[PDB]
Amino acid sequence: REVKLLLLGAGESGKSTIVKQMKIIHEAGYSEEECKQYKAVVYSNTIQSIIAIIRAMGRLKIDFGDAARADDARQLFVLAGAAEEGFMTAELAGVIKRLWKDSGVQACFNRSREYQLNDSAAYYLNDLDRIAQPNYIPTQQDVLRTRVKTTGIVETHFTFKDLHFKMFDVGGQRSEQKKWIHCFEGVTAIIFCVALSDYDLVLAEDEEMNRMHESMKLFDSICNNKWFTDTSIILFLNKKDLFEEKIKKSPLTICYPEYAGSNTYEEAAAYIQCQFEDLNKRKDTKEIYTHFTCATDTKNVQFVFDAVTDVIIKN
Ligand SMILES: Nc1nc2c(ncn2[C@@H]2O[C@H](COP(=O)(O)OP(=O)(O)OP(O)(O)=S)[C@@H](O)[C@H]2O)c(=O)[nH]1
Ligand SMILES: [Mg+2]
């Protein structure tokens, strides 16, 4: 039987990372030639991330820790063009590594909720020595960590448990939300992705709009749309790894002023789950299948999608 899955959710919620995991788990992963295609994306992500931090020190008036980094930051923009083409000279890596270890840069990095920074910024920058090597070939995890905004509709196919899956992925940014209707036909199940760690962030398209509140509005619209009455609604509360770290130091009251629980993972996670599930206007006739995920963790996604497939199989 053919099973059509539709991935929905706000931008950067993890939808395309789930797509990548299906290729890794169910079709032997990315070949060397495929990994090499992502080398330019890894380099682009890395240079864009350090540039975003440097940019933010200017707006937030944060000085470098050592005054010598001013020359490194000059050389950064001089040499950045190579990375945006898939090349990484030993001189550029040294410039980035020194900037990344500077205490003023690190101070700005730890204030990233005051600007826009890729979630994978630290992953790549902490691994600069490995990714800067000659003949560097991105690993599966490197590919999973890449960030490219999805425009259009991405369709991938795979076989699992004798089922032929057709998985559809759409862009989640506001400009792409008008395109969601084009995938609405014949959907067996929806996987709605939520970035748990978005609770203290604002939209790139609007600094006044809380990211998690926008996610709730989208989920409210989808879950209660009569067109999806007979469609299984699966909720991926994603980026649980980033949420577990963030909940220790960033109060959830930024998002939900009425939250009275502790700053611990289990209580706060369950509170967010209930906030989303309470948007369901048909609690007795419509079920939501909620899973907490780390979309970049292949082992976690494999077991979660195994459990999801059983629900789809049983209908
Ligand atoms: N640490 C961590 N990073 C994640 C997780 N899920 C996704 N990411 C990272 O977050 C970034 C955004 O993920 P992505 O898959 O592109 O979201 P998206 O929903 O497809 O975004 P869009 O196409 O609507 S603009 C990527 O760099 C990805 O590697 C997670 O569970 N944990
Ligand atoms: Mg995407």
UniProtKB/Swiss-Prot annotation:
EC number, as in UniProt: 3.6.5.-
Any one Pfam family match given in the protein's UniProt record, by short name: G-alpha
Region feature G4 motif, mapped onto this chain: 234-241
InterPro entries the record matches: Gprotein_alpha_I, Gprotein_alpha_su, GproteinA_insert, P-loop_NTPase
PROSITE patterns registered for this protein in UniProt: G_ALPHA
Subcellular localization(s) per the UniProt record: Nucleus; Cytoplasm; Cell membrane; Cytoplasm, Cytoskeleton, Microtubule organizing center, Centrosome
The name this protein goes by in its record: Guanine nucleotide-binding protein G(i) subunit alpha-1
Gene assigned in the entry: Gnai1
